[model samples]
Target: TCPFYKKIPGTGFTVDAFQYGVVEGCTAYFLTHFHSDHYAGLSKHFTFPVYCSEITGNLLKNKLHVQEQYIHPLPLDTECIVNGVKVVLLDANHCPGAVMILFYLPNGTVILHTGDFRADPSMERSLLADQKVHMLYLDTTYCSPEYTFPSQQEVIRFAINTAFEAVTLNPHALVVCGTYSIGKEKVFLAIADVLGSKVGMSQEKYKTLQCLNIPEINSLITTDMCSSLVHLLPMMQINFKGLQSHLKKCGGKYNQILAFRPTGWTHSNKFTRIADVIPQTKGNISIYGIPYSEHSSYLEMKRFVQWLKPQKIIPTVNVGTWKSRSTMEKYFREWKLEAGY
Candidate 1:
């Protein structure tokens, strides 16, 4: 159910709408970040003007082999003109190089497109106070009251302690973290730093990490998966099959396995329900599906809208069915009732 709205109204610009073969009437493509879902469908095959943060542009060039000339790196918090449209990039706080864009069209229309963000009231300073947004494109990943969880700092500390306890509980058990290319890097990094264990990953992931240029991150990484009890793996492989396969990679030295499948509220989530967070165990394997999503909680989404007081909001995620869309829009109404349009 890909319900992402690619086209930005009143302009030829498209934000994170880079599905393969979907290119048509876009004057330029603006990316919020380098996360796969947001930057998917972009590759060397296509040739159109791309505008994003300097970091995102570098990732595109290094990982995706995109030409340097076509990628335009826009500076944050500064209003820049792109094809006569006044656009400004604000920190999204979700992943590296992620930005929420503000467009001031010559027609006096204002549009705020949050290409995927975590609302930290701090961005209010970045938004400045005077400008009121007309329409907002929000990352409604967690747009429900029940989708709330602890703060990232709290969660990071939680990760460090939880992982340390796991290691203490079963000294012989191997611990691994499931991760995406960019977002979940912090969870493993923090956990490893606290536990004094070097994290392990594939060469592919190592190359991607180099692009991010995270300080002290390289020192925490180790190529030898067997050496580290705590390893960083693809988020998709937190299950029994992958866990069992990885044990073989380590010469089957461990009898038990503990893994973290960190993520936000998802459709078929099995392990961590934010409401109840204990590792689900099966066949000598325990996996923790904690609330480690980079996206904002539902309350953050509400707070973001309340501050902007936009006349209308467009939910970009979960737009597959009108029913889902309707449920999200009602949240908008609730926020408006709390304040104003």
Candidate 2:
């Protein structure tokens, strides 16, 4: 029901534009995370052996209701096989359980699929025994624009300050921020840190969060931050479209609501309409879109191309056309880097 690609061979590697193919005879290993874009229609095409992180395994189990045998867990940097291909998994630094898979061939070709990644060092706290890379299949998703984010600590301070200001201005007002059930833990943690709060997760996320216990994140939010006014996501998800009804009756209808969404995609405008329901009439919605993803940005691609010094640079993510390719080629040429698709 979702999108797929047409993998064109001799596409200079790193081209993943193939649509669905039946799995009965397939020989390739499929690795995925929880993103709707990556895993959306995956199971339908290939009920074959699929590899993912333990967190991802649990998410698919709880959210999609998939089976144990169909899924296998890949620990960081360890070699494992699914559908006869050797693979190495690494933390993608995206959402929880998100990963990047490096595919290897017996013929001496090493191609890495960076399911998504951010080289920014702050969120880089997750552990991997080794820290080396080669020939990344690369998620050149954000390879065009450079992004600067406030330090994680600073953002937490801001959310807390905002929360306090809201409470002080009107005790009855219920200020809310919109975020997903996963990945936004740090943002929630930041808000919680300031407000001296705690997060009571949905059943699915609670199970996963319990597994990813690091000492600092072990207690991400404290009791001080949480209050009766705060609402957890499970309440909204199960209640469906009527969730907003409670917000108005409880307090100031059009008060403060902060929301975040990844900006830009194939169906961006349509998604705006889909997200319209969350902001609702009673709340004044403020959206902050950041160009950050576990995926590589265009600038990252250029940097990677520079680092690898590949004779030919191939870019995907729907901008793989020859014209776009040549256009980027000229741009890179000015920077003295080679380019092609």
Candidate 3:
């Protein structure tokens, strides 16, 4: 019944595990990425065949300890069949190993499941060329006008610049970036290159990044806190209490700590799912929250929906409630113009 889990009658294929209860009926499963929300119900004891990108598969194996034999890695732009349904994957551009899944059902209906992706004109054109998407599972995460921000590259540059400024203001200040363990490597890598320093991470995060096999990022990992001025820490670890604990333990080697969280929630008017009003400073800690999102904004979502013109739109999150759905519908008023209805 959930938009995240769709069934094709007798077909046992299931999408992301928003509801782990459906795992028993799934003959095969496709994970969009390694994000915790997308990978809710996976474990080593699970027996169903799982399909996902190589990076996601690696995360499942190393991080979640999902069985090796059960994990199947899907290559981008490749077509595969499972349960008599044709499936294809494309880079979601949200995070490494993230993908947009397209399914051609037996009834000739095409369903596009966008598992948390941002707008890329090229990707949109490719999806629009040969597919009349019958059903669309949208990532309406920022389905509001206030989420206008620059491209990811620009956002990364802004973050690096901000970090540089923070360090320049106080030479003894430690610049710590708030990022997820898997995604947002670009920001850290750019900071390392620009600052001419190695990026520091915990040994656990170091191990996981090494497993990703990304040479650019792996080469920058250092467990030692003194190895670099810019340290890459988990998003939650950069908070006031977290930094305070770390600083106290280190014996005040760094005079001040400048932390910034790069995420989409920076631009939100009302708080919704991880979005926070930032620039809150306490004591010697200076914090800035920047808009660096992998999901599409309302304008991007509007243009994308107009381009693909899906016959039906399904909100992946908050599907059971009418209030959120009603709010989302206001943004898709021009859907018919693109759908040619």
Candidate 4:
């Protein structure tokens, strides 16, 4: 059978969607986060009905641009059986629409997959309701030593202060940043609101905002305001350089472009994934490098792993890939040693 739930000889993964076989015996793929790699296979390959929370499911359709046929949206914390396994969703607290999954097996062992989670007290509180977890498949992306991040409030404060400082000093200098079109747009709006009546939207971003059909947000700004302060729906990060080039072509200069980060993990790791895309800067272009990742920090990963205390911590994403698994294992051991492993 193609989709057999048998572990790869060396990989510890009992499931492989890489070769589609029989999904009949499988329970479900609990897509906890919406990052590129975490949902990479599913985006183009897998189409099986996924057991996901409402928020994450929306992200699939709204943000990731996945079609509707592949999703089976579940309520948060609601336990249900599909493919003979009990599944529940919990708040992940890493990004706007992220989740952690709890898979309860018939044999009474519970598996906790903390999908790109973090140490938001609210997130911890949400997971605490489950009370018991046995096998933990952790997210250890930031388990290495070089990772560091500031709190959400701090990032917010810095954003406001930086924009204020720019407006105060030059009033014409543009502050450019790298950010997500959906997640960071609203935060940018909030920041712009503080700037008061001078902010405007880029034409490209206005098109995206219109596509989403958010009428209330449409009413938030007049045409003139939309032209000066904010760039509503921005380009994907892959287009950062192109966006800058295009903006300059369109004569956008010294406008203080603000980029919103999606997760701290991207900034902290600076290894695999899109974090490597950030480049050395030039004059007139300021990448804010804000701490806005959807995944948890290394210390946060350590805390969640310890809470579960499973026999074996099997990582699911980049942490468990063929090339990165050993590095991640060393990462785990080092973390454990630091915490007296």
The digit string of per-residue lDDT tens for model 2 on 172-233 reads 44444344545656655555555554654445555656655445765563222234345445
Runs in model 3 deviating more than 4 A are 1-5, 8-10, 22-25, 267-278, 337-340
Assess every candidate by TM-score.
0.89, 0.66, 0.88, 0.70
Residue 298 error, candidate 2, Å: 4.6
The lDDT for every candidate, in the order shown, is: 0.81, 0.49, 0.75, 0.56
For candidate 4, lDDT tens digit of each residue in 1-341? 43222222222223324234434444445565555545655553455666566656766676556678877777776777766566677777655456766766666777666666665655556645556766666666566656766565666666777677676777665433344434444456556766764335555445444443344766554446325554433335424575466456446444434454444544344443332334334554555445555456666666766655566677755642566778887866766676663
Stretch of 10 with least lDDT, candidate 3: 269-278
**Candidate 3 C-alpha lDDT tens digits along 128-179:** 4776888888888877777676667766766677667777777778778877
**Model 3 lDDT, full chain set:** 0.75
- Model 2 lDDT at residue 73: 74
All candidates in order of TM-score, best leading:
1, 3, 4, 2
User: How many clashes does each candidate structure show, in the order listed?
Assistant: 0, 23, 0, 26
lDDT of 3 at 266: 57
